[PDB]
Amino acid sequence: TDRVSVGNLRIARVLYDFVNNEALPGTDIDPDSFWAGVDKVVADLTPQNQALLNARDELQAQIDKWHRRRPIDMDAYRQFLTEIGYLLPEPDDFTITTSGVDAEITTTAGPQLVVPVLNARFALNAANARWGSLYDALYGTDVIPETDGAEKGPTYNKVRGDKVIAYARKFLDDSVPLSSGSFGDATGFTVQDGQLVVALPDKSTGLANPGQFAGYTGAAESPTSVLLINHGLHIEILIDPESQVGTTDRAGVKDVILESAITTIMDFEDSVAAVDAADKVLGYRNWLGLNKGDLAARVLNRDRNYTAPGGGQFTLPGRSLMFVRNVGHLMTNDAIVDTDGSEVFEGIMDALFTGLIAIHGLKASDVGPLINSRTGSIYIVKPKMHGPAEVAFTCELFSRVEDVLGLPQNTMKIGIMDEERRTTVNLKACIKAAADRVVFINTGFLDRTGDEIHTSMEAGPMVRKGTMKSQPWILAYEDHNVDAGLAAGFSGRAQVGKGMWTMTELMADMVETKIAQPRAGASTAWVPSPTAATLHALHYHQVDVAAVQQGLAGKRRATIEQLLTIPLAKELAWAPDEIREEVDNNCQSILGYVVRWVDQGVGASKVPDIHDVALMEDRATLRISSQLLANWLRHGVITSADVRASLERMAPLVDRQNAYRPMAPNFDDSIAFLAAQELILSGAQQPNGYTEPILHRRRREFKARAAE
Ligand SMILES: O=C(O)/C(O)=C/C(=O)c1ccc2[nH]ccc2c1
Ligand SMILES: [Mg+2]
């Protein structure tokens, strides 16, 4: 049909054509030595991949047994885990040796953006979100309360605009402070002899710390803009009295631009639905556009030029340093199949194909104008790993792709996600396994909750979904992550990252609460939009991360006993109503996500919950919900009759909460509905509670039954 024959591999034509005509040219790599390398690498590495997945299952079953066979004694649970190799011994202290890393990762602290790579429009904006308007972000979201007078209507509201402006002025004061006065009384900006002087109504002043003055545009007397700096992040004041917002401003300021999303993660994993070669080629084509510099729908902003505080003409990068998030070790994709017809490990494929593609990010001009890494590294996030032997295996896999691609060893750097229990209680061993390729560690708290629930499925009922964020195990897990990174010398070398803020409409809540992440010494945290990146940039001007990290070293705040504390609910924990509610809540979350996945191949979007509070979540949330319900089922809390009633109930609301095809009132005809049912009912049987097998299968079912 459409398969090409390369050795033991039968590649899909769409993939074979794309790689040949689009990816390879300019890579200075013979289009034949490559595919041989694909064939070799697949053949040689497929064993160990399959052996590691078997290890997971073997381990999972011993744990299922120990709980079935009955209290809960911590010291016993701990000895058992050690006995089974689950809980490996902790290595001697060390320091990572990664090099060739850009400043956005080794040094800068600031928000990290995650965008689905199959959406070029999102992917463009995310790349362009290195710089963002603070007026926009304040005006458009509820950071400035829509009280009275300040309501946000079809036209621009001057009262609301004044409210934004005051917010930004107060921000300026608390970031680049004046030696005397306050930006809110300022009337003009000039640069005179390399210093910056702010025209106050009664006098003039400079910055308290004059070094925070980074540059400017336009003539030094009537500057177009003035560039500030705090905590290694740039602030830009756009000056134009001629403008709309300009005339109303006491110093004629049009805007304040913040350096926001310092890095972005282009995603092939949980934020996309890609079940075939057709799907993977789209994301591949976009990642290529991104690496060349020519992705268009609206284009990638080019770099920003400035005048240094004297006369020199420097430049700043206009884009976010891009990572790519490959899929993990579990799934296979039929984009490539062997002679017997077995599907090829998608993880190995992603390494070969995202690595190849990223070579363009390394070179400018002719067959792309734009450069990702200034230092010659390729940044890859590797999710869903369980233990140091799976980290090691990812090293080796990268070592081999490099050989195939002809890059120096250690080019491809790894972004380690701490989002599986077996990784968590062995994190030091995971970092040691990747000591010379590791550019971050990051707490993937949602997936981590999923694994947490599935690992102890046979122990008893779990606490509700909302109760998880406050649990002893997850607070220990968050801190433990930071101690290990800092111990291994991440400060000034690698990022130390935290999770995603899914409540996309609740920005005031984000601005008030997300500050805790850098306060815990994390040099980066995840946001789901360019706007939330700008707002989360504020926290880094408020919190000196370098120092928090500095005064956290040497400390150990988690014990293994705290990590291993299973989030079990106590006896008589819940009234009948709180259960019905939690059931309805998970069924609506599962329904509204799965329906967009199977029917439209959307892996991440703005989906309203039960109360229409819009949440932008991905498969990790689904993994939590479906595993939670599955767990309550397994342990008596609810029945099978209950699940169906809830699904049946929530379905028509999801339909009304949404091109779209309604699941109600015809339930066993919607493949999506049958998927959401399967996810819950087959939940305990899924390997590690993983949601992709069912999802992939059911999406492919939808694709087929729609061709005619
Ligand atoms: O915690 C995890 O397991 C994790 O890796 C997070 C995510 O991947 C994630 C979550 C929600 C999102 N909304 C938009 C994008 C997005 C991404
Ligand atoms: Mg995850």
XYZ file of C-alpha atoms and ligand atoms in Angstrom:
726
model
C 0.000 0.000 0.000
C 2.073 2.900 1.354
C 5.026 1.202 3.053
C 8.665 1.552 2.068
C 11.141 -1.271 2.671
C 14.234 -0.385 4.685
C 15.917 -3.463 6.051
C 13.783 -5.079 8.705
C 11.512 -2.021 8.756
C 8.440 -1.144 6.704
C 8.147 2.672 6.969
C 4.967 4.516 6.095
C 5.324 6.393 2.816
C 4.130 9.740 4.200
C 6.828 9.492 6.835
C 9.439 8.247 4.403
C 8.683 11.058 1.933
C 8.568 13.768 4.594
C 11.905 12.776 6.111
C 13.582 12.460 2.716
C 12.405 15.624 0.997
C 11.915 17.884 4.042
C 14.047 16.820 7.013
C 17.225 15.485 5.442
C 18.214 18.212 2.958
C 20.666 20.583 4.588
C 21.514 18.110 7.316
C 24.558 16.973 5.337
C 23.525 13.357 5.986
C 23.229 10.730 3.264
C 19.524 9.785 3.015
C 20.534 6.135 3.036
C 23.036 5.929 5.854
C 20.215 7.479 7.911
C 17.520 4.880 7.312
C 20.144 2.184 7.811
C 20.824 3.794 11.162
C 17.106 3.834 11.868
C 16.991 0.113 11.038
C 20.103 -0.690 13.083
C 19.134 1.382 16.145
C 15.591 0.002 16.167
C 16.862 -3.582 15.876
C 19.617 -3.245 18.457
C 17.735 -1.212 21.076
C 14.155 -2.672 20.881
C 15.115 -5.586 23.182
C 16.170 -3.456 26.192
C 13.161 -1.192 25.784
C 10.894 -4.252 25.987
C 12.867 -5.668 28.914
C 12.435 -2.441 30.929
C 8.652 -2.445 30.390
C 8.573 -6.024 31.637
C 10.469 -4.886 34.742
C 7.735 -2.333 35.494
C 4.994 -4.995 35.234
C 6.846 -7.598 37.306
C 7.399 -4.969 40.041
C 3.827 -3.729 39.877
C 2.493 -7.238 40.462
C 4.603 -7.947 43.544
C 3.263 -4.715 45.012
C -0.315 -5.668 44.069
C 0.280 -8.916 45.964
C 1.876 -7.527 49.145
C -1.219 -5.293 49.549
C -3.800 -7.961 48.683
C -2.167 -9.970 51.421
C -2.857 -7.156 53.920
C -2.827 -1.576 59.445
C -0.191 -0.530 56.825
C 3.289 -0.798 58.414
C 5.785 1.736 57.003
C 9.017 -0.047 58.034
C 7.716 -3.276 56.448
C 6.684 -1.550 53.233
C 10.115 0.011 53.080
C 12.027 -3.262 53.559
C 9.858 -4.994 50.979
C 10.500 -2.346 48.309
C 14.251 -2.627 48.924
C 14.021 -6.406 48.689
C 12.450 -6.234 45.215
C 14.901 -3.755 43.691
C 12.182 -1.117 43.608
C 14.072 0.986 46.106
C 17.686 1.087 45.034
C 20.435 2.369 47.333
C 21.439 6.064 47.078
C 24.754 6.824 45.298
C 27.573 9.002 46.631
C 27.172 12.744 46.170
C 28.318 14.184 42.837
C 27.957 17.151 40.513
C 26.567 17.093 36.952
C 28.939 17.642 34.036
C 26.651 18.923 31.299
C 28.090 21.552 28.978
C 27.161 23.357 25.793
C 24.025 24.661 27.471
C 22.446 28.048 26.704
C 22.008 30.780 29.275
C 18.222 30.413 29.243
C 18.730 27.150 31.096
C 21.958 27.415 33.071
C 21.391 30.857 34.459
C 18.088 32.574 33.755
C 15.071 31.953 35.971
C 11.596 32.360 34.548
C 8.437 30.654 33.316
C 8.492 27.695 30.929
C 5.749 27.306 28.353
C 4.285 24.005 27.086
C 2.467 23.993 23.765
C 1.137 21.161 21.541
C 3.405 20.829 18.492
C 0.586 19.751 16.132
C -0.857 23.245 16.493
C 1.317 25.604 14.478
C -0.680 28.661 15.501
C -0.145 27.829 19.180
C 3.449 26.785 18.469
C 4.236 30.124 16.769
C 2.780 32.176 19.627
C 4.660 30.095 22.184
C 7.924 30.712 20.362
C 7.029 34.390 20.158
C 6.135 34.516 23.873
C 9.731 35.307 24.919
C 8.417 38.857 25.090
C 4.889 39.839 26.084
C 2.789 42.884 26.913
C 2.013 43.406 30.610
C -0.820 45.785 29.789
C -2.511 43.100 27.658
C -2.129 40.409 30.276
C -3.391 42.646 33.092
C -6.238 44.144 31.059
C -7.493 40.918 29.504
C -7.507 38.760 32.644
C -9.044 39.049 36.117
C -5.792 40.167 37.683
C -7.454 43.556 37.602
C -10.849 42.838 39.110
C -13.881 43.505 36.939
C -15.597 45.219 39.795
C -17.613 48.318 38.924
C -16.386 50.907 36.436
C -13.615 48.475 35.523
C -15.874 46.087 33.600
C -14.419 44.736 30.361
C -16.748 45.523 27.447
C -16.575 45.673 23.619
C -14.478 48.905 23.697
C -11.494 50.083 25.738
C -12.322 51.068 29.351
C -10.283 54.048 30.600
C -10.954 53.302 34.293
C -9.760 49.705 33.779
C -6.804 50.978 31.786
C -5.821 53.321 34.602
C -6.042 50.338 36.930
C -3.696 48.351 34.694
C -1.238 51.231 34.426
C -1.112 51.674 38.214
C -0.430 47.954 38.624
C 2.456 48.162 36.178
C 3.826 51.318 37.842
C 3.784 49.621 41.204
C 5.597 46.687 39.578
C 8.299 48.966 38.226
C 8.812 50.463 41.709
C 9.236 47.053 43.317
C 11.628 45.800 40.646
C 13.864 48.568 39.364
C 13.497 50.956 42.321
C 14.296 54.677 42.082
C 16.800 56.250 44.489
C 14.100 58.824 45.137
C 10.426 58.871 44.170
C 8.207 56.433 42.274
C 7.544 55.593 38.641
C 3.881 56.492 39.180
C 4.828 60.176 39.408
C 7.277 60.078 36.477
C 6.866 62.495 33.564
C 9.686 61.660 31.169
C 12.612 59.399 30.332
C 15.982 60.419 28.897
C 19.426 58.860 28.713
C 22.354 61.167 29.485
C 25.928 59.873 29.612
C 24.987 56.197 29.923
C 22.904 56.762 33.039
C 19.094 56.873 32.905
C 17.327 59.853 34.443
C 13.636 59.804 35.326
C 11.947 63.219 35.128
C 9.945 63.656 38.371
C 7.485 66.550 38.699
C 9.735 68.317 41.225
C 13.200 67.048 40.194
C 15.035 64.098 38.621
C 16.381 60.783 39.889
C 18.158 57.706 38.578
C 17.692 54.051 39.444
C 18.879 53.049 42.913
C 20.813 50.342 41.186
C 21.962 52.018 37.940
C 23.168 48.639 36.651
C 19.555 47.609 36.115
C 19.652 49.923 33.081
C 20.167 47.647 30.069
C 19.693 49.798 27.012
C 17.215 51.774 24.934
C 15.886 52.468 21.445
C 15.521 55.793 19.583
C 17.435 59.010 20.341
C 18.782 59.368 23.887
C 16.670 62.499 24.391
C 13.349 61.177 23.049
C 13.883 57.395 23.465
C 11.421 55.107 21.717
C 11.864 52.603 24.550
C 13.875 52.038 27.703
C 15.244 48.609 28.629
C 15.444 47.513 32.248
C 16.719 44.419 33.938
C 15.985 42.657 37.202
C 16.963 39.123 38.242
C 18.321 38.386 34.768
C 14.915 39.135 33.247
C 14.349 42.139 30.951
C 11.694 44.834 31.355
C 10.912 47.174 28.430
C 9.060 50.475 28.718
C 7.503 51.469 25.381
C 7.392 55.275 25.128
C 4.977 56.890 22.675
C 2.807 59.846 23.789
C 1.329 59.941 20.293
C -0.417 56.629 21.021
C -3.867 55.800 22.373
C -2.752 54.663 25.834
C 0.173 57.065 25.439
C -1.657 60.395 25.678
C -3.431 59.291 28.868
C -0.104 58.429 30.522
C 1.799 60.923 32.739
C 5.022 59.966 30.945
C 3.493 58.946 27.604
C 4.058 55.249 28.094
C 2.295 52.889 25.695
C 3.174 49.616 27.410
C 5.450 47.554 29.580
C 6.910 44.529 27.835
C 8.174 41.684 30.045
C 10.629 39.000 29.089
C 8.244 36.099 29.795
C 8.553 32.517 28.482
C 12.346 32.104 28.514
C 11.956 28.510 27.343
C 9.159 26.637 25.581
C 8.480 22.932 25.301
C 7.047 21.883 21.950
C 5.075 18.795 22.790
C 4.632 15.378 21.162
C 3.338 13.775 24.311
C 0.324 14.423 26.555
C -0.899 17.608 24.861
C -1.383 16.024 21.412
C -3.481 13.243 19.906
C -1.238 11.587 17.339
C -2.037 7.972 16.635
C -0.620 7.364 13.152
C 2.041 8.342 10.625
C -0.260 11.013 9.252
C -0.496 12.592 12.709
C 3.214 12.332 13.526
C 4.189 13.872 10.190
C 2.173 17.040 10.977
C 3.949 17.587 14.285
C 7.231 16.681 12.581
C 6.579 19.252 9.894
C 5.857 21.918 12.505
C 8.940 21.112 14.575
C 10.951 21.493 11.345
C 9.383 24.870 10.568
C 10.271 25.894 14.116
C 13.847 24.711 13.760
C 14.324 26.295 10.360
C 12.652 29.555 11.307
C 10.051 29.576 8.573
C 6.896 28.219 10.225
C 4.008 30.422 9.082
C 0.201 30.625 9.311
C 1.929 35.111 11.304
C 5.626 34.340 11.612
C 8.482 33.963 14.114
C 9.568 37.341 15.442
C 13.159 38.121 14.734
C 15.628 39.305 17.305
C 15.345 42.614 19.137
C 18.090 45.223 18.705
C 19.069 47.789 21.325
C 21.503 50.548 22.105
C 23.727 49.733 25.056
C 23.962 52.370 27.869
C 26.723 54.220 25.999
C 26.295 53.786 22.260
C 27.009 50.157 21.354
C 24.435 48.189 19.377
C 23.583 44.868 21.017
C 20.755 42.432 20.285
C 18.490 40.184 22.360
C 16.880 36.916 21.247
C 13.256 37.373 20.188
C 12.226 33.762 20.658
C 11.989 31.257 23.489
C 14.684 28.637 23.557
C 12.805 25.577 22.350
C 12.766 22.111 23.857
C 10.996 19.165 22.263
C 9.125 16.693 24.458
C 9.476 13.217 22.990
C 7.099 10.473 24.057
C 8.334 7.922 26.595
C 9.327 4.242 26.553
C 5.845 2.681 26.597
C 3.886 3.092 23.366
C 4.407 1.856 19.813
C 3.249 3.553 16.644
C 2.368 1.888 13.315
C 4.150 4.675 11.406
C 6.831 1.985 11.178
C 6.284 -1.788 11.434
C 8.675 -4.732 11.209
C 8.454 -7.770 8.952
C 6.091 -9.658 11.295
C 3.981 -6.484 11.383
C 4.800 -5.429 14.929
C 4.606 -1.671 15.615
C 7.886 0.132 16.325
C 8.616 1.820 19.672
C 7.453 5.414 19.200
C 10.029 6.683 21.698
C 12.952 5.474 19.637
C 11.349 6.989 16.533
C 10.941 10.381 18.212
C 14.637 10.439 19.088
C 15.769 9.720 15.549
C 13.274 12.145 13.996
C 13.274 15.056 16.432
C 17.068 14.919 16.619
C 17.457 14.928 12.832
C 15.080 17.852 12.590
C 16.796 19.861 15.334
C 20.028 19.999 13.313
C 18.421 22.956 11.489
C 18.134 24.832 14.760
C 21.929 24.766 14.797
C 22.611 26.408 11.464
C 21.428 29.548 9.709
C 20.740 30.430 6.091
C 19.708 28.278 3.156
C 17.777 25.005 3.417
C 16.540 28.162 7.653
C 17.241 31.696 8.853
C 16.707 31.065 12.568
C 18.864 29.448 15.261
C 17.573 27.761 18.433
C 20.568 26.944 20.591
C 23.450 29.403 20.438
C 25.698 26.780 22.052
C 25.038 23.744 19.900
C 22.804 21.587 22.047
C 19.515 19.895 21.301
C 17.066 19.974 24.159
C 14.728 17.041 24.673
C 12.260 16.381 27.488
C 11.940 12.699 28.314
C 8.702 11.982 30.203
C 7.281 8.956 31.981
C 10.497 7.276 33.146
C 10.655 4.747 36.013
C 14.028 4.448 37.713
C 17.692 4.997 36.820
C 17.958 2.058 34.369
C 15.399 3.795 32.149
C 17.354 6.999 32.363
C 20.555 5.173 31.407
C 18.723 3.540 28.529
C 17.662 6.975 27.262
C 21.288 8.117 27.426
C 22.417 5.164 25.360
C 19.554 5.739 22.923
C 20.681 9.358 22.448
C 24.294 8.279 22.126
C 23.287 6.154 19.177
C 21.004 8.581 17.348
C 23.912 11.041 17.513
C 26.177 8.489 15.830
C 23.538 8.041 13.130
C 23.241 11.799 12.771
C 26.951 12.511 13.029
C 26.645 14.986 15.895
C 29.215 15.125 18.668
C 28.367 12.872 21.595
C 26.162 14.575 24.232
C 24.642 17.029 21.757
C 21.117 15.942 22.647
C 20.472 17.003 26.196
C 17.788 15.408 28.314
C 15.051 17.116 30.326
C 14.251 14.571 33.042
C 10.639 14.545 34.248
C 10.116 13.391 37.827
C 6.580 12.110 37.411
C 6.754 8.458 38.328
C 7.163 7.081 41.855
C 10.065 4.782 40.978
C 11.914 7.795 39.606
C 11.043 9.928 42.667
C 12.424 7.581 45.363
C 15.565 7.122 43.235
C 15.962 10.625 41.809
C 19.630 10.947 42.769
C 20.306 7.720 40.851
C 18.302 9.065 37.923
C 20.331 12.235 37.883
C 23.574 10.295 38.179
C 22.493 8.155 35.209
C 22.193 11.292 33.065
C 24.997 13.325 34.686
C 26.339 14.718 31.403
C 23.155 15.228 29.366
C 20.788 16.530 32.017
C 19.493 20.073 31.606
C 16.544 19.872 33.975
C 14.520 17.954 36.511
C 10.854 18.770 36.806
C 7.940 17.649 38.932
C 5.169 16.362 36.698
C 2.732 16.324 39.571
C -0.341 15.160 37.675
C 1.277 12.075 36.104
C 2.978 11.577 39.462
C -0.404 11.469 41.159
C -1.559 8.916 38.603
C 1.358 6.585 39.249
C 0.902 7.164 43.006
C -2.720 6.023 42.670
C -1.977 3.024 40.418
C 1.080 1.833 42.364
C -1.088 1.389 45.479
C -4.382 0.500 43.771
C -4.731 -2.702 45.806
C -4.067 -0.991 49.146
C -7.450 0.695 49.688
C -9.512 3.704 48.525
C -7.592 6.892 47.687
C -8.423 10.390 48.902
C -10.400 12.553 46.477
C -8.746 14.289 43.521
C -8.855 17.765 45.112
C -7.334 16.427 48.346
C -4.225 15.225 46.532
C -2.456 18.570 46.221
C -2.233 18.805 50.005
C -1.129 15.228 50.652
C 2.030 14.412 52.664
C 3.475 12.425 49.723
C 3.267 15.192 47.136
C 4.613 17.908 49.404
C 7.535 15.612 50.203
C 7.951 14.833 46.512
C 8.076 18.530 45.542
C 10.789 19.343 48.068
C 12.757 16.155 47.460
C 13.044 17.177 43.813
C 14.681 20.456 44.802
C 17.136 18.916 47.322
C 18.415 16.468 44.672
C 18.872 19.014 41.925
C 20.642 21.387 44.291
C 22.785 18.576 45.697
C 23.915 17.610 42.196
C 24.735 21.237 41.398
C 21.849 22.451 39.292
C 22.448 26.004 40.472
C 24.103 27.738 37.550
C 23.972 24.570 35.444
C 20.511 23.031 34.984
C 16.887 23.994 35.500
C 14.881 22.987 38.563
C 11.254 22.880 37.508
C 7.690 22.606 38.782
C 4.229 21.882 37.451
C 1.460 23.379 35.406
C -1.224 25.876 36.332
C -4.323 24.521 34.605
C -6.873 27.097 35.804
C -6.509 29.277 32.707
C -9.209 31.818 33.593
C -8.204 32.177 37.229
C -5.209 34.477 36.681
C -5.473 36.594 39.876
C -5.353 33.297 41.748
C -2.279 32.310 39.751
C -0.543 35.631 40.390
C -1.296 35.271 44.098
C -0.348 31.611 44.480
C 2.131 30.448 41.808
C 4.815 32.549 43.571
C 5.331 29.552 45.889
C 7.227 27.636 43.183
C 10.175 29.990 42.894
C 9.926 30.492 46.663
C 10.727 26.808 46.952
C 13.834 27.411 44.813
C 12.553 26.345 41.397
C 14.216 28.292 38.600
C 11.353 27.444 36.222
C 7.664 26.522 36.250
C 5.047 25.586 33.647
C 2.383 27.833 32.113
C -0.164 26.999 29.355
C -0.251 30.350 27.527
C 1.841 33.367 26.470
C -0.310 35.495 28.789
C 0.089 33.313 31.860
C 3.803 33.437 31.068
C 3.869 37.250 31.355
C 1.906 37.151 34.605
C 4.176 34.392 35.989
C 7.186 36.507 34.996
C 6.176 38.916 37.775
C 6.994 36.334 40.469
C 10.590 36.121 39.327
C 10.969 39.843 39.758
C 9.488 39.399 43.219
C 11.558 36.361 44.188
C 15.350 36.091 43.926
C 15.648 32.443 42.926
C 19.449 32.400 42.917
C 19.426 33.281 46.611
C 16.611 30.944 47.660
C 18.553 28.149 46.031
C 21.667 29.396 47.760
C 20.154 29.209 51.216
C 18.592 25.803 50.585
C 21.713 23.813 49.791
C 22.889 21.029 52.093
C 19.372 20.682 53.420
C 17.262 17.520 53.211
C 13.601 18.118 53.884
C 12.015 14.878 52.764
C 12.445 11.411 54.206
C 11.670 8.221 52.287
C 8.960 7.607 54.896
C 7.292 10.822 53.785
C 7.590 9.972 50.098
C 6.159 6.504 50.669
C 3.100 7.776 52.536
C 0.200 6.415 50.510
C -2.671 8.943 50.081
C -5.242 6.541 51.623
C -8.638 7.832 52.776
C -9.638 7.105 56.365
C -12.712 5.150 57.522
C -16.178 6.709 57.053
C -14.401 9.457 55.159
C -17.266 10.607 52.931
C -20.981 11.340 53.075
C -23.017 9.944 50.156
C -23.284 13.437 48.525
C -19.519 14.156 48.475
C -19.040 10.887 46.619
C -21.761 11.512 44.013
C -20.159 14.878 43.457
C -16.647 13.429 43.102
C -17.981 10.769 40.768
C -19.795 13.334 38.604
C -16.694 15.485 38.710
C -14.359 12.837 37.380
C -16.858 11.576 34.805
C -17.318 15.052 33.376
C -13.562 15.640 33.335
C -13.000 12.311 31.580
C -15.884 12.831 29.154
C -15.052 16.369 28.079
C -11.423 15.491 27.404
C -11.898 12.130 25.645
C -14.594 13.420 23.366
C -12.252 15.982 21.798
C -9.474 13.421 21.605
C -11.176 10.580 19.749
C -13.442 12.734 17.561
C -11.110 15.575 16.645
C -7.609 14.488 17.666
C -7.213 17.381 20.133
C -4.953 16.557 23.073
C -5.128 19.833 24.979
C -7.683 22.656 24.877
C -9.762 24.935 27.110
C -12.397 22.618 28.624
C -14.934 23.838 31.234
C -15.438 21.658 34.293
C -18.750 20.957 36.036
C -19.142 24.669 36.865
C -17.739 25.922 33.532
C -14.450 26.900 35.226
C -12.287 26.459 32.114
C -9.341 24.099 32.614
C -6.536 23.553 30.157
C -5.310 20.077 31.064
C -3.935 16.982 29.235
C -3.690 13.158 29.450
C -2.125 13.324 32.924
C -5.347 14.664 34.365
C -7.222 11.950 32.519
C -4.815 9.430 34.015
C -5.665 10.796 37.496
C -9.458 10.863 37.044
C -9.849 7.499 35.384
C -7.490 5.845 37.853
C -9.279 7.492 40.788
C -12.713 6.261 39.739
C -11.191 2.870 38.893
C -9.788 2.747 42.432
C -13.076 3.598 44.134
C -14.737 0.912 42.062
C -12.099 -1.700 43.057
C -12.672 -0.960 46.754
C -16.412 -0.682 47.259
C -16.806 3.097 47.335
C -19.037 3.050 44.248
C -20.589 0.517 41.889
C -20.501 -0.211 38.169
C -24.137 0.963 37.995
C -23.017 4.264 39.522
C -20.291 4.932 36.936
C -22.656 4.392 34.009
C -25.303 6.686 35.562
C -22.743 9.385 36.055
C -21.361 9.040 32.513
C -24.884 8.974 31.148
C -25.775 12.055 33.208
C -22.743 14.198 32.382
C -22.624 13.355 28.681
C -25.406 15.655 27.449
C -23.958 18.533 29.485
C -20.568 18.086 27.885
C -22.431 18.178 24.513
C -24.130 21.449 25.492
C -20.784 22.581 26.902
C -19.413 22.171 23.373
C -17.787 20.090 13.981
C -18.853 18.438 17.237
C -20.817 15.169 17.438
C -23.136 14.591 20.442
C -22.608 11.493 22.590
C -26.147 11.715 23.961
C -28.647 10.142 23.800
C -26.961 7.412 21.757
C -24.262 6.173 24.111
C -22.946 2.904 22.715
C -22.504 4.472 19.267
C -20.188 7.251 20.346
C -16.760 5.607 20.286
C -15.636 8.476 22.556
C -18.237 7.567 25.189
C -17.208 3.923 24.899
C -13.583 5.044 25.337
C -14.395 7.056 28.483
C -16.251 4.051 29.806
C -13.370 1.703 29.016
C -10.832 4.053 30.642
C -12.663 3.780 33.962
C -13.804 0.148 33.746
C -10.517 -1.269 32.368
C -8.584 1.210 34.520
C -6.900 -1.183 36.927
C -5.659 -3.350 34.044
C -3.859 -0.580 32.129
C -0.072 -0.746 32.597
C 0.775 1.825 35.293
C -2.667 3.328 34.824
C -1.467 4.650 31.481
C -4.214 6.089 29.335
C -2.610 5.927 25.858
C -3.361 2.301 24.757
C -7.126 2.705 25.024
C -7.031 6.279 23.723
C -4.870 5.475 20.732
C -6.899 2.446 19.825
C -10.197 4.300 20.050
C -8.989 7.323 18.084
C -7.801 5.027 15.318
C -11.221 3.342 15.448
C -12.848 6.759 14.886
C -10.487 7.603 12.004
C -11.305 4.356 10.200
C -15.084 4.400 10.653
C -15.350 7.753 8.897
C -13.394 7.258 5.670
C -16.385 6.402 3.464
O 2.248 16.922 35.405
C 2.482 16.299 34.387
O 2.454 15.078 34.224
C 2.877 17.201 33.069
O 3.882 16.778 32.378
C 2.028 18.413 32.573
C 1.708 18.553 31.491
O 2.169 17.947 30.613
C 0.591 19.548 31.093
C -0.398 19.680 31.800
C -1.476 20.591 31.461
C -1.379 21.326 30.299
N -2.243 22.276 29.709
C -1.687 22.706 28.585
C -0.631 22.143 28.429
C -0.432 21.217 29.585
C 0.695 20.248 29.965
Mg 3.191 14.377 32.389
